[PDB]
Ligand binder design. Structure first.
Ligand SMILES: *[C@@H]1O[C@H](CO)[C@@H](O)[C@H](O)[C@H]1NC(C)=O
Ligand SMILES: *[C@@H]1O[C@H](CO)[C@@H](O)[C@H](O)[C@H]1NC(C)=O
Lengths: 83, 94
């Protein structure tokens, strides 16, 4: 047997990067191994590990002491590679 | 075990057409678990197990049915090799 796994991995991202001072925040990244298969015909399925739940959060930078929008990934799951 | 794998599996498919005699051929199907990952949208990395090399082959069926159109041709895709590749890339591989 082989199982499909998709997980939200803890990361630190650094927003940067304009003429202001960068900040580090805690986030998640999706990482996984979903099933895909391709069966031939005569004249097909793709899943990938992507955000299942996320939210937008504002991060304010000091210059040197602007706002930046960041995506907070909460959960991940195997979904159709379509969109 | 924590590795991405893409398997070209031997199959037998059956090619047919009404009023004709079916044929079985040997083909391969791709099956796998490629890595995908997403960072916070911008850098999406999507791989899937898809044909790396394929070809079109004609298969002729006999239709002992009929004197005009005693036989018929069908086009089939032969999958030769499979591999983890960037998603959305077209299956057909030549
Ligand atoms: C990962 O970070 C999240 C912050 O949302 C925290 O709740 C969780 O305890 C952490 N777990 C691990 C394994 O890093
Ligand atoms: C499976 O059939 C394919 C036909 O493309 C052939 O290349 C391969 O040698 C065969 N392998 C086995 C184990 O029968």
């Amino acid at each position: 047997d082989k199982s499909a796994w998709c997980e939200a991995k803890n990361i630190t991202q650094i927003v940067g990067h304009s003429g202001c001072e960068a900040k580090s925040i805690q986030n998640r990244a999706c990482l996984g191994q979903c099933f895909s298969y391709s069966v031939p015909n005569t004249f097909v399925h793709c899943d990938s590990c992507m955000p299942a739940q996320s939210m937008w959060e504002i991060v304010t930078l000091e210059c040197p002491g602007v706002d930046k929008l960041v995506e907070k990934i909460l959960h991940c799951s195997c979904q159709a590679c379509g969109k």
